[PDB]
Enzyme design. Sequence first.
Site, mmCIF file in Angstrom:
data_model
loop_
_atom_site.group_PDB
_atom_site.id
_atom_site.type_symbol
_atom_site.label_atom_id
_atom_site.label_comp_id
_atom_site.label_asym_id
_atom_site.label_seq_id
_atom_site.Cartn_x
_atom_site.Cartn_y
_atom_site.Cartn_z
ATOM 1 N N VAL A 238 1.259 2.188 5.837
ATOM 2 C CA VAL A 238 0.761 0.818 5.692
ATOM 3 C C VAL A 238 -0.769 0.827 5.738
ATOM 4 O O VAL A 238 -1.366 1.650 6.436
ATOM 5 C CB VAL A 238 1.315 -0.111 6.801
ATOM 6 C CG1 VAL A 238 1.071 -1.575 6.459
ATOM 7 C CG2 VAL A 238 2.803 0.131 7.021
ATOM 8 N N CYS A 239 -1.390 -0.081 4.986
ATOM 9 C CA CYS A 239 -2.850 -0.193 4.926
ATOM 10 C C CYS A 239 -3.505 -0.379 6.292
ATOM 11 O O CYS A 239 -3.038 -1.185 7.100
ATOM 12 C CB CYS A 239 -3.267 -1.344 4.009
ATOM 13 S SG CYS A 239 -3.624 -0.851 2.311
ATOM 14 N N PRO A 240 -4.593 0.370 6.550
ATOM 15 C CA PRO A 240 -5.386 0.191 7.762
ATOM 16 C C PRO A 240 -6.480 -0.867 7.569
ATOM 17 O O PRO A 240 -7.497 -0.849 8.270
ATOM 18 C CB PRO A 240 -5.992 1.579 7.980
ATOM 19 C CG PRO A 240 -6.074 2.188 6.618
ATOM 20 C CD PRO A 240 -5.110 1.469 5.712
ATOM 21 N N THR A 241 -6.251 -1.783 6.629
ATOM 22 C CA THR A 241 -7.210 -2.836 6.287
ATOM 23 C C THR A 241 -7.313 -3.920 7.362
ATOM 24 O O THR A 241 -8.315 -4.636 7.428
ATOM 25 C CB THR A 241 -6.883 -3.492 4.927
ATOM 26 O OG1 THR A 241 -5.514 -3.919 4.912
ATOM 27 C CG2 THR A 241 -7.119 -2.512 3.782
ATOM 28 N N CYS B 124 0.804 -1.234 0.000
ATOM 29 C CA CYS B 124 0.000 0.000 0.000
ATOM 30 C C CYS B 124 0.834 1.279 0.000
ATOM 31 O O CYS B 124 0.302 2.375 -0.176
ATOM 32 C CB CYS B 124 -0.981 0.009 1.173
ATOM 33 S SG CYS B 124 -1.992 -1.480 1.286
#
Lengths: 165, 166, 166, 167, 165, 165, 167, 166, 166, 165
Positions: free
Chosen positions: D46-49, C166
């Site tokens: 970084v992705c908060p997924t 990401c």
Amino acid sequence: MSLINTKIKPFKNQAFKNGEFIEITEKDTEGRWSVFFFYPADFTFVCPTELGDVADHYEELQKLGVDVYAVSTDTHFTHKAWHSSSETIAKIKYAMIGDPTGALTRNFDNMREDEGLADRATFVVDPQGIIQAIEVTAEGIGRDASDLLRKIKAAQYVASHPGEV
Amino acid sequence: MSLINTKIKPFKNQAFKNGEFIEITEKDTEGRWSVFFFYPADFTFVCPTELGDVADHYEELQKLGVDVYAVSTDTHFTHKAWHSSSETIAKIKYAMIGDPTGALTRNFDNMREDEGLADRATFVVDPQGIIQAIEVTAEGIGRDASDLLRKIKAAQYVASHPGEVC
Amino acid sequence: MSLINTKIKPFKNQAFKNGEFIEITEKDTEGRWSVFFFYPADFTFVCPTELGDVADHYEELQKLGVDVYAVSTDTHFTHKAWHSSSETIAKIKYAMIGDPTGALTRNFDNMREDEGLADRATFVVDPQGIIQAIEVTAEGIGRDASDLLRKIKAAQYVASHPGEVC
Amino acid sequence: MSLINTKIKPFKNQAFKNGEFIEITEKDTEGRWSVFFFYPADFTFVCPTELGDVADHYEELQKLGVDVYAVSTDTHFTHKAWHSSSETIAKIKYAMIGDPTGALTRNFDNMREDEGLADRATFVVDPQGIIQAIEVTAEGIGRDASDLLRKIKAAQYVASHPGEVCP
Amino acid sequence: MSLINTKIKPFKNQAFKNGEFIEITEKDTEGRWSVFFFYPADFTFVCPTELGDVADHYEELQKLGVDVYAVSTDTHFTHKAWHSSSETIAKIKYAMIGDPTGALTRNFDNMREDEGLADRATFVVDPQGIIQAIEVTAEGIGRDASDLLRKIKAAQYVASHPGEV
Amino acid sequence: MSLINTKIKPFKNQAFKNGEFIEITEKDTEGRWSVFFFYPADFTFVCPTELGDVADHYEELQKLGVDVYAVSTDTHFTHKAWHSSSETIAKIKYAMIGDPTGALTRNFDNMREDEGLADRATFVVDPQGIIQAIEVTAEGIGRDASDLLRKIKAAQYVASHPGEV
Amino acid sequence: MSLINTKIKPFKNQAFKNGEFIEITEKDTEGRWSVFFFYPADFTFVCPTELGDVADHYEELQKLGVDVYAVSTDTHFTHKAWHSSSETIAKIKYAMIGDPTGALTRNFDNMREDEGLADRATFVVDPQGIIQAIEVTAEGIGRDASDLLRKIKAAQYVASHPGEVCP
Amino acid sequence: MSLINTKIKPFKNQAFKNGEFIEITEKDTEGRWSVFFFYPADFTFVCPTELGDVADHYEELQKLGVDVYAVSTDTHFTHKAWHSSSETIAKIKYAMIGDPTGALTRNFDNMREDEGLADRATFVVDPQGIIQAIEVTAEGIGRDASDLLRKIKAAQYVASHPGEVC
Amino acid sequence: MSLINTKIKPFKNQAFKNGEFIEITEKDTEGRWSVFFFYPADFTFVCPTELGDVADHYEELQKLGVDVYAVSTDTHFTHKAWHSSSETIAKIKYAMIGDPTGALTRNFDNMREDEGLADRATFVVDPQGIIQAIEVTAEGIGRDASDLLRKIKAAQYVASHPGEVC
Amino acid sequence: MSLINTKIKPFKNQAFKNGEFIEITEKDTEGRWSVFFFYPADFTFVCPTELGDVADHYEELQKLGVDVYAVSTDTHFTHKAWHSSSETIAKIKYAMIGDPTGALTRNFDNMREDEGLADRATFVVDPQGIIQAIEVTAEGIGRDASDLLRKIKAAQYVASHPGEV
């Protein structure tokens, strides 16, 4: 911490052997099989059959290259007297170590601190100094010299034949 | 500092006895003559003659009112497996204490610290909890169950008739 | 004092692998992806499917260059017996580390102090010795081997191509 | 010395939930299934997924009676800002605990000493306080929320049916 | 023990300087006049006019050769978000040091131990590392950048001219 | 450990208040706003405009209910002599605390241990005893009484109005 | 444990002498007869005649080779001010040592702990550093300078004629 | 730790006074002006004029209500012998305190540590027990008794009328 | 911890011998048989028969090559005075050591701590410095010089002919 | 620290007296004059004339109300043997205390630490427990029982006639 499979601690003691007095150190146990036979006191009313039983096997023990050291907190002077006074102790041809300081007794963790006397214990020591067999009993329980002899023969076998199924 | 002539420390261990799992404490040894038979490990290539010799005298030991406790650092689950696998261990009618914590082994100062296994040691404990006889041998040197039997009879005699001789 | 992202502490243990006893040290894990699979004890009544799952994916794990080490507080002698006993444990082609001292178990902070057994924990270790994944579950909660593979593949992707998220 | 199968230590931290600041203690976890979701820092690239995937299963978690606690070494003020200017964090219905002292983070042995940040760890805590499941991953390795959901359902099964193996 | 007239302790922190992330150490402060501006936290409801007032004088501070460092217990990631969210913080061209460990905060004995946040403090450091001026205020009381500027002008005068009658 | 937001320690010192000798304790500061003005020594060649600037605002400080205390390691006898010798010190109507022991100076961690003198520090204390503002400067750098006055006005506002958005 | 017949401890203090500031150490007392005159504080309401009576005999003391050191817990800046605005202190030709740390005062065990001031004590020190005479009085009891002059002359006599009793 | 302006520490010593042995404690000094006159040793070759001077002013000292205590590290038995021996010491009508332990000597910090003798020191003590004047001199330097009287009269004037000096 | 059979500690003391002052160290006792005769104080009302009895045998002691050192906590100046005052102390031809510091008395562990006086003790020291005989008595109980003489002759015999009897 | 004029420390020892064995504590010395006669070891080659000399005066000592306690580090069993074995020790009618722990020996600071044997020392103890006379000699130097008897008679005189010219 167990005392099995550990090297013996250095010492310097006066002893009685066959008449007369000699000095024994940890240097004397080098390259030799040793037996440390601890007992409470000399001139007690307990039958000295434990010590006399070892004396009967001493000729066979010397054949196997085993030295016997009887130790108590009494003086070597007392050992000489008890050798002359007692019927069974007259048979003792091996060394009778006097340990008035209790330093040798404490080396084997065998002191009755409140009594100032050694416990009823036997130690089998190899030429390297490593303890191979420990045998401690209470007052009144006898120690068999035949089983001690069997243990030494088994201990000498393991040293020559190391590791087997 | 000697372990002889002292009262045994409290313990709580799981054991295997005749196809059943039971919990043994120091309470079970009270009022009873006890023998704590320590050994290294299960399923080793060393001859199990030491434990088998005790099994031969076990009927004679129960006749004297003596309980036998075989202890090792292995689990009690392993003891059940070893009872079914070995021919000599099949004879074991007495309890097989599993001591994974080593707490019982530490109580008798009998732990090979760098191996995590119990040393070859036998302990004779009177009904009061006091240790009367200690026998320790290095790996290879065998223990005699006949001389153990002799010592217990000698220990029971002194308990019955103290102060006599010689 | 978090165990994640730290190098594994040195060890020297005996193990059972494919009808052979071998000694495994920290040197054997060097330059290789390692998985340390801890479990309570051998010969338990608990279903040994957790070890059976890893056995089924072992071919796929060896394909990715990953070594599997199943560690228990039982002896390596006990592991051999368990390999011959159970049908599920017979499938185990990887090494079964015996840890009687609990030295390796305490290295990964995974010892049940009052029980003397390893907890249900899985550790993913990279070629450097650094721990990348930790998974600990209580008695009863199953560990998924297929999700472990996903975690190892992800760990290998991060190692190859850093900063690709990401 | 492992943290598994031990009761959680007491704590007193400020949190953020649905536009309002609340104080959460160990008393709030009593009698309730709790999940402690630790992560390094807010506003990271970084992705908060990871938090968002938990938010998707949160409806199912509430039906099971499971409370979710997102813990970070950042302040509760920061959690509000990250809730406002993020697409995935806007979906968070559960509490976002701030741990500026790192006291709650150290209770779970999850502190990076040299960084002053929490590690990627997830803890499953029962109504009694006893920890049932631990999952710690490194930077990059994703935590599966559906597998976490499976673990909680498995942890509840052994709680109601004790010692049911195998058969 | 007083913090005044002492050399600053070594540190290694990541910071946010207008758009880009950099790393600042005790090495960067050497040979330069430094101002360490401590404050509680980012995204607080309290007025950010303290940092905005320093930002206005920053062009004059760079003309005097003074580096400004804004320090809080928040991460450098949080400083970036606060920069492009508030109009007052957007004026900041100087470095915004993130101190999640609190190591730099503890170097100046400026940590609210029970809160895990920095106290409202300002430190003036000379090229040698010696602290020349300290100003600490409680939550709510504001600090003046105009007075800070005056104190630095006076500090640079004393450093060049020893002894004043 | 930070000195900010903590209660002041007990003290018992003799002082000089416009013509007369008095004794000041921690009891006198209670229920009142207090300003502790520390400085090196009396009869120094350095400009006494620091104390003179406070003296000018003192009438406004008494209107706000603020007691001013000038502290140095010199005796109260020396404060009297310095009062009727310098034109700038003659303007002082507030108390001049003499601290020969340095007990009060050490209470605020403000002693130059190797010099036996007080550092240039200013402390703002509320009725409860809690320190609200600290300002320490190195030898040569001056302190502003106008900024001090502004900080007290702000401190009294926060004390009456909790929480400001 | 008495301070008599012991060598004086090293010191480094600032002093005032004839309008000029000088630094005095234990090196300056070497090979010289020294008198350390301690007093509470400067600008006290008590008569400064104790220091003034020493100043009157100072001409005779210099001829004998005796250096006088007036010690106070005040600064050397204060000594200058007291020299300027006092009738009796204007007569002081000798050094006025300032001891703001109290280090020199503590070397002679002459510190009032609760007051932070030196006591009224006079010490006679020989060229070697060995203390020959100690005289300590309370507030109010005056120290006789002519008797001090007699003591120094007696101390010099035993130094040149050692062990001359009685006869 | 300055000895001036401090209360005298308690003591219990034997003394010789006018052909009689008496015990002197700190209680005997209470409510009275006391003078402690320390000196090295009895029977020395050093001229005993310092003690002779105090003997000549003793009538004047008793007139002002001042008690004189001559203290030495010698025994009280030795003092009696010295009173009978020397012509100057025969004039001593005040008490001669014997301090073999050196307890009273160490109270006034006046012990020659490596010599075991008291130093030449005079102490003026008020009715409260507070020390007002200390005078210590080395071996050879004489102590003036007439200047001591001046100091006592000044000390008594300060006690009567405080704050009457310039 | 016993003082017997140990080497004497170094000392430096002033003494009175036959109208002359001399300094005695441990060097003076080297290669010589020494007797350290400790006693409380000079000029006491206790009968000086203990020191007088040693004086009677002193010629016989010098005949055996034995030095006698009378020690007390008093000064050597006092010893000179006591030698001229008393009839029995006039006979003392041996050295009278003055020990004001008590250092020599402390060396032989013979100090009445709260009295500051030496106990009634006699020490016999061989040429090597080793203490061979210790005799301590409480105040009142007398010491026999004849039995002291017997002990020295017995000590010299063992030194000459060691290992014999019985 | 000297042991003269000090009270004896509590003890509990097994002893041999006249045949047979008894137990002696510090309670047994209360209200009675006691003599503690320490000697190295039993059955040594040194002539036992020291102990036999006391035995000759024991009838006179019992007349004076004095109890005699011969102590060594040997056991009481050894004392019985030595009583039967030796010509001179057969005369011993008083108690022969065995001290294997050396606790009683250490109470009188009389242990040869490196030998584990008592030194050649004699202690005279009054009814109160206070030690009145100490007599220590080296190996080979004899202790006279006549001089011991004289000392006790003198000690009993001081107790009844306290303080005289």
